[PDB]
Amino acid sequence: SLFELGKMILQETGKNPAKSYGAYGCNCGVLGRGKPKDATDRCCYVHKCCYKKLTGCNPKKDRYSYSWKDKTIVCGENNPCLKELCECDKAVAICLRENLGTYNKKYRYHLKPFCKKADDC
Amino acid sequence: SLFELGKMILQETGKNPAKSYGAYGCNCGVLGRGKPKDATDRCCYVHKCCYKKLTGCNPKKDRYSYSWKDKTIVCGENNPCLKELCECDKAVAICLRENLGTYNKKYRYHLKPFCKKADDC
Ligand SMILES: Cc1c(C)c2c(c(C)c1O)CC[C@](C)(CCC[C@@H](C)CCC[C@@H](C)CCCC(C)C)O2
Ligand SMILES: Cc1c(C)c2c(c(C)c1O)CC[C@](C)(CCC[C@@H](C)CCC[C@@H](C)CCCC(C)C)O2
């Protein structure tokens, strides 16, 4: 669920998730997808596409277990959907962290009209 | 959907909805409800409870029609659920405007996992 995703994002990036990613670019936080403005935004795009792939669980609502071991997010599920869901969240948290180097505040609260259509997943 | 909700908030409050209300207190934003931090937050609390009563439509993604007449949000007939949804959104937008005076930027990006459990609606 969003609770685990937000925690992973904090864990990986060290940043308040809503502040840095609640509305960033065309894919982070915003509703729907759009052509990514940069790497951080692409992480969110990949994430939404990852969610689109799930079957059997609600990405927003379903809780799942995971742990922090050797400073790594370790999913703790066997159910295919919760496992994949957890893995989707883990990937976006890592990706956001990995792209902090090009994170650009000008994309915070990016206006949707400036977003081009996303390639489909 | 979030588009309409955001537009209403912008219309009533004059503020960028994502920035001011995308994540505020324990109730404005993702992650259900929590004991409200202040009046602004209380608006979002009532708003989430309002959504609970909806049957047949998705508050997040289902778009609907409304008009700005005499500077008032006027919900389109749409269908029962969408009309109720529109009324839920209109109410929260009005409520946020009425309480703009006590908006506290300290609650923007409030960490959801530092909210007491909300009472049931
Ligand atoms: C519906 C939906 C939303 C809302 C969205 C994204 C996607 C793919 C969605 O389908 C991606 C990014 C973003 C805004 C990012 C924000 C992450 C939130 C889940 C964060 C909530 C954070 C809390 C729990 C962690 C607190 C930890 C304490 C120790 C401080 O969330
Ligand atoms: C997953 C999820 C999210 C992310 C969420 C909420 C709920 C119940 C959810 O289950 C409620 C409130 C908010 C806090 C939404 C507040 C703002 C948005 C609706 C922004 C809309 C965009 C605005 C600029 C549009 C302006 C109109 C243009 C014509 C200029 O975010």
Side-chain angles (χ1 to χ4, degrees), chain A residues 1-69 71-116 118-121, chain B residues 1-60 62-76 78-121:
Chain A
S1 71
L2 288 173
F3 168 72
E4 291 75 41
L5 164 61
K7 192 166 180 196
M8 286 179 192
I9 295 304
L10 205 213
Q11 291 173 135
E12 287 286 327
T13 75
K15 302 284 187 42
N16 175 300
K19 189 163 153 281
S20 291
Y21 309 104
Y24 181 101
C26 297
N27 300 274
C28 298
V30 309
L31 178 38
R33 300 180 294 281
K35 176 182 177 190
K37 293 297 182 180
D38 68 4
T40 288
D41 195 13
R42 186 144 45 240
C43 295
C44 294
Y45 168 84
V46 159
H47 187 240
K48 278 167 184 189
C49 283
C50 193
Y51 273 13
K52 219 146 192 64
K53 269 219 294 304
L54 303 170
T55 60
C57 65
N58 182 332
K60 71 181 269 72
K61 304 231 202 92
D62 300 352
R63 292 332 205 282
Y64 56 72
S65 300
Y66 80 90
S67 59
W68 180 244
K69 304 284 196 180
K71 297 191 284 186
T72 302
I73 291 172
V74 181
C75 290
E77 295 295 348
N78 172 259
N79 172 273
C81 195
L82 292 181
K83 165 68 176 179
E84 279 146 47
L85 167 60
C86 181
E87 288 301 330
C88 286
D89 290 349
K90 166 171 175 174
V92 74
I94 286 158
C95 188
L96 294 178
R97 184 242 308 155
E98 286 173 340
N99 290 289
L100 274 168
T102 57
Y103 183 95
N104 190 322
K105 290 178 191 161
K106 77 181 164 178
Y107 292 132
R108 283 179 175 170
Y109 306 115
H110 185 69
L111 291 314
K112 178 51 172 181
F114 288 122
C115 294
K116 299 86 172 187
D119 287 316
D120 228 278
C121 299
Chain B
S1 76
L2 283 284
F3 317 23
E4 288 66 52
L5 172 60
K7 184 154 77 166
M8 283 182 198
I9 291 179
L10 170 63
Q11 292 176 133
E12 288 291 324
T13 71
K15 299 290 193 174
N16 177 296
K19 179 169 220 327
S20 274
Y21 303 107
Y24 183 100
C26 294
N27 295 277
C28 301
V30 296
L31 277 59
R33 301 168 305 132
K35 177 179 227 171
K37 286 287 161 204
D38 63 1
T40 289
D41 204 12
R42 217 98 81 312
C43 299
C44 295
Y45 181 108
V46 168
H47 183 247
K48 276 162 173 174
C49 282
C50 194
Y51 279 6
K52 290 199 164 179
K53 336 174 191 292
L54 303 169
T55 315
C57 64
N58 182 169
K60 159 193 188 177
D62 286 339
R63 300 188 103 281
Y64 56 76
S65 180
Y66 77 88
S67 306
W68 179 243
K69 305 280 190 182
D70 178 38
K71 297 195 289 194
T72 301
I73 295 166
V74 181
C75 290
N78 296 103
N79 99 141
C81 189
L82 289 186
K83 173 174 278 190
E84 290 160 48
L85 168 57
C86 177
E87 291 297 336
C88 289
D89 294 346
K90 172 182 171 171
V92 79
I94 285 174
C95 187
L96 297 172
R97 159 179 51 78
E98 287 172 343
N99 289 289
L100 254 179
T102 61
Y103 182 97
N104 194 322
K105 282 187 203 177
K106 83 193 200 196
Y107 296 131
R108 198 182 274 177
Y109 317 124
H110 181 76
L111 286 339
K112 12 308 216 57
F114 286 160
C115 290
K116 301 209 240 266
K117 187 163 211 164
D119 304 323
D120 6 305
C121 297

